[PDB]
Nucleic acid binder design. Structure first.
Ligand SMILES: Nc1ncnc2c1ncn2[C@@H]1O[C@H](COP(=O)(O)OP(=O)(O)O)[C@@H](O)[C@H]1O
Ligand SMILES: [Mg+2]
Lengths: 228, 182, 319, 228, 228
DNA sequence: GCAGACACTACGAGTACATA
DNA sequence: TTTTTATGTACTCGTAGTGTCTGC
């Protein structure tokens, strides 16, 4: 019931999406931002044996970085979370699950309207250039028959007219023309190769990132234009 | 060097065209005009029957009443707002005083530093009140060397203590005023 | 014939004017905008009116659209200091390959503690005003530091002359007609729209909204007219019973407002100040303020509120 | 008198207990809390010459943080404290010894009613867990032979019901039962090893921390219980 | 037109002079310091295809450091700056020409009123202690026949009359003595000592360098003692 | 094997508010 | 023709010092 450092690294990522988390027993974890903005699901290497809801996941792991990694976690008779160390013990209070906005069931992502496949280092460079060019919102669309991502500076761009980047990704074999806008603040996924699934029907839409262990559903923007 | 016969842009342009922001900070300060503020002119509107229409202006029953506290002819309404004006609307407070003050034509205005430092310094030392502190000095000016107790209290004249009474520029001519007491 | 933003659903912005000529302004101001657009480059303009919904942000956007300007719209509340030095300068120093005038609209700029960012903007207008111009839309003009008004062309909205008001309301009565035509609202009585425009005038956003709230039936019959002309109440029954010295209704309305005493006493002072004579203004605030002073000391709060009603009836000389 | 790095750091610690300090001729420095809850003492390697009282010890160390290590701290011919640098020279005004509440009474600790020792990294982990877990009071009792320190949330937990942290510090020998509650606030020792000495008889008691250089004697909270 | 590491390093250095040195077509780069008190000029390896204005060079090179070194930098189709990488394409905005100040003319070097030099590996060791021992304005004067450099901290020395660090560099063949007093905030050289060439007229008086990489100019100071 | 740079906190300042 | 008094609270902003994370 100890938590490996890659699992906790994934947990500290989920804390960026939602300040809390509701995790039941098993190997599957998930969370969704309160403002329905992002949703992450992932199966991991450790096994949770008991349902527990954590009101402050950020502070939980920040405290869990103070005991040795061999720390045995458990549900104490003190009905909270017991962090047994070599000498010390941390009784982190379990929270009432009603106070943690969490997906009551995993979001079954619909059939993708368009499929591409971002690379991990391509995603890495995209974050580096955004922090340098103040890129706040990006758009994934078609350019000369290929699926590309284009970032803007919605602060200075407003209308989103002046392109500031173009990560040419895959090729598009369909006939549809789409302009899906994602907010960079909702790019809460950890770096890693992702199969990008796009869906949009009418005035709805969402993007899914299938990972080697962690999946992420990030929301599209109000101005996303498509012909699906 | 300077390219002599080229046009020199204004200091705003000089500071702005340079990521040297401390000079840009000096550029914005050039328009501070904080000395050119407003403050009241509602009292004048109270005793002149002018369309004050305060709303956004800084209304202080504490102040607006205490200004009419100097003029005894305005004191009947000030005595009422002291009594029952507590918990009365600011807009209602100006509106009561509109039809309450007699005539207008706004008038004049409304205990020294080097004494008031000693009075407040003796008060903090012996943990006494203003009244008691005031009397302490007055008896010490007459008897066993107040000059001695001035030296006993030269260490606890901090700038936080000093500036608390008369900021302006005196708390520096007062900081090292009681310095020479040894 | 009216510009619609067919993704809005909210009426009050679905039919927001696009150009100056679609706006409803006083003739001189409307002419002064059409001439400012004709001259090519926009000056530094402060658009202000304490009464909201008069045309500020629309005209600010309409000037940028008429000129076809590379407009940078910004919420004046997020216009902090690191913003004026940051994305504002980056935009002002961008290359205008397009030739269109760079104009920055700072919407709702008048704010409390934005003083340092405000003076920075003034000093910014001595450096980058060569490139770009700035349109400010504010409610309180004083929230704007004096150096900015000194530089900017201050056009005061919502303060129309009588003849300008008459024509403006008539234009607005035709606008709400063209709204009701395009939305699907039946105008059974034209005096509804006239009373709609007139009741809440200078705020054009609010009068369009009121039409939406009164469109709940899909038709503007005289019943809706009776609604708009119905001057509502707040505490109209107590004021009415105080003017009539009706001891019976004061006796029965005291248990109505003894629940929220502190609000009612404050609302009562607000209403009587308009309805009562000036020599009674003295006795009014004295009777009320004393009654509120002893509020809570009085054992029976309901009877104490009736005491206020009896005291006012006897002592108020009414209008 | 010359002020080294280890001694100024101690004065930076003693400043936290009392805004100033009174120090008389010798190598023994001592300060007490204004309310009388935390007493600290320290024998040091730097020897001071005269007797001096500093009212603004915090500001005194800040002004000293510009002079080179050769800092000559001397008495002024009138009485003040001049600080001679390699070049510059500063003048600081000294204060009367009655302005600074001095401990004055270094009566020795009695007999240790209970003895254990807390490690440097064990105090470290206690102070770092409390920073993340908001622990305001700790109680030192016995559990299963070994004695432990338990941390609570006195505000979030009236009578110290639910533990939030527990650190074991070795086993107890005698057959006594107790529970000394210490306030975390009035606990101002610097990092390091401290042989924990605990004295309490009847309704009076105290906790003494024996560091390799200095000693910290804190008071125990009134709620504490013992059968000594 | 890919930029090499030598070019980017000189550009990075030229950024310490002007907030955004505009460059012209060719292989010559030059940057007048914002106001007009420092200048720099250099020839470098890479050919310039287009004359553009740059606004924030430091961030521009910071964006360049995110793509490959052999990224083909082109002038964008809309008149900006395209940085073609492998998959990406960064569109750095071109600046307005009136928003940055560049040399109207690459400043002709007058006939040197005096010629000297520094060293070969003393610059790195000279400016190290110069910044270390807080000295602002620096002076250059003849002493013992040789011309040397020795400045004063104008902060604690508003009247220029002290001494901090001397440097013997070589004898001065000329037969006339002077003393120029350049502001420290004007000098900012790359590694390797260069040639120091002096000049002075009536109410003027520059002072410049010639280098293996770049030439650096500074300014006059009105109250400078001139002999020419 | 640490620096850099973003990220975080604390604090002075200024602001607005409700009391006596 | 004038320009200020106390206590306690909550919020925003700016900047500056400190903390955690990353390079061709
Ligand atoms: N002068 C006007 N002419 C026509 N419509 C107006 C006018 N002023 C406001 N409106 C209506 O109000 C909305 C715009 O309000 P606006 O004036 O931009 O806000 P503010 O005046 O508070 O800045 C628009 O949807 C528009 O329909
Ligand atoms: Mg608006």
């Amino acid at each position: 019931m100890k938590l490996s450092k890659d699992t906790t690294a994934l947990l500290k990522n989920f804390a960026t999406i939602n300040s809390g988390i509701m995790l039941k027993s098993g190997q599957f974890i998930m969370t969704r931002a309160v403002n329905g903005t992002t949703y992450a699901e992932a199966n991991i290497s450790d096994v949770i044996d008991f349902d527990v809801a954590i009101y402050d996941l950020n502070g939980f792991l920040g405290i869990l970085s103070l005991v040795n990694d061999d720390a045995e976690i458990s549900q104490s008779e003190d009905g909270n979370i017991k962090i047994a160390d070599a000498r010390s013990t941390i009784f982190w209070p379990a929270a009432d699950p009603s106070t943690v906005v969490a997906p009551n069931k995993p979001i079954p992502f619909p059939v993708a309207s368009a499929v591409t496949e971002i690379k991990a280092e391509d995603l890495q460079q995209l974050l580096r250039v955004s922090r340098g060019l103040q890129i706040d919102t990006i758009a994934i669309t078609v350019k000369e028959g290929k699926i590309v991502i284009n970032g803007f500076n919605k602060v200075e761009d407003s209308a989103l007219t002046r392109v500031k980047y173009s990560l040419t990704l895959g090729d598009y074999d369909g006939e549809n023309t789409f302009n899906f806008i994602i907010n960079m603040a909702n790019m809460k996924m950890q770096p890693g190769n992702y199969k990008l699934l796009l869906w949009a029907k009418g005035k709805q839409g969402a993007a899914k990132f299938e990972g080697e262990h962690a999946n992420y559903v990030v929301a599209l923007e109000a101005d996303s234009t498509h012909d699906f | 060097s300077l390219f002599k016969d080229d046009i020199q842009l204004n200091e705003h342009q000089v500071a702005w065209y340079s990521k040297d922001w401390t000079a840009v900070q000096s550029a914005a300060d050039s328009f501070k005009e904080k000395a050119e503020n407003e403050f009241f002119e509602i009292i004048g509107a109270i005793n002149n029957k002018t369309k004050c229409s305060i709303a956004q202006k800084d209304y202080s029953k504490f102040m607006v009443e205490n200004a009419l506290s100097q003029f005894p002819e305005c004191m009947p309404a000030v005595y009422a707002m002291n009594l029952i004006g507590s918990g009365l609307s600011d807009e209602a407070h100006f509106n009561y005083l509109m039809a309450a003050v007699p005539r207008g034509k706004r008038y004049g205005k409304w205990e020294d530093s080097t004494e008031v430092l000693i009075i407040k310094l003796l008060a903090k030392r012996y943990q006494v009140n203003t009244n008691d502190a005031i009397n302490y000095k007055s008896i010490l000016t007459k008897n066993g060397k107040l000059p001695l107790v001035l030296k006993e209290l030269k260490g606890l004249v901090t700038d936080d203590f000093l500036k608390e009474v008369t900021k302006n520029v005196k708390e520096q001519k007062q900081l090292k005023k009681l310095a020479l007491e040894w | 014939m009216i510009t619609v933003n067919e993704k809005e659903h909210i009426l009050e912005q679905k039919y927001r004017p696009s150009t100056i000529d679609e706006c409803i302004l006083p003739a001189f101001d409307k002419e002064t905008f059409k001439s400012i657009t004709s001259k090519g480059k926009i000056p530094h303009i402060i658009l202000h009116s304490p009464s909201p919904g008069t045309g500020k942000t629309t005209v600010a956007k309409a000037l940028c659209h008429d000129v076809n300007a590379d407009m940078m719209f910004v919420n004046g509340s997020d216009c902090k200091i690191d913003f004026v030095r940051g994305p504002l300068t980056n935009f002002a120093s961008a290359a205008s390959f397009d030739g269109r005038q760079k104009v920055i609209v700072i919407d709702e700029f008048c704010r409390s503690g934005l003083a340092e960012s405000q003076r920075h903007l003034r000093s910014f207008m001595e450096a980058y005003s060569s490139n770009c111009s700035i349109i400010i839309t504010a409610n309180n003009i004083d929230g704007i530091i004096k150096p900015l008004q000194s530089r900017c062309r201050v056009i005061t909205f919502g303060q129309p002359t009588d003849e300008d008001k008459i024509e403006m309301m008539k234009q607005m009565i035709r606008r709400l007609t063209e709204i009701c035509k395009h939305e699907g609202i039946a105008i059974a009585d034209m005096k509804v729209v006239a009373a709609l425009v007139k009741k809440n005038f200078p705020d054009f956003r609010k009068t369009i909204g009121e039409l939406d709230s009164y469109s709940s039936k899909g038709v503007l019959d005289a019943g809706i007219l009776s609604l708009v002309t119905n001057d509502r109440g707040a505490i109209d029954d107590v004021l009415e019973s105080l003017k009539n010295k009706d001891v019976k209704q004061l006796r029965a309305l005291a248990p109505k407002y003894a629940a929220d005493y502190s609000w009612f006493v404050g609302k009562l002072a607000e209403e009587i100040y308009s309805r009562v004579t000036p020599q009674s203004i003295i006795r009014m605030y004295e009777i009320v303020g004393e009654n509120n002073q002893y509020h809570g000391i009085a054992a029976n709060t309901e009877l104490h509120l009736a005491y206020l009603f009896i005291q006012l009836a006897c002592e108020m000389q009414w209008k």
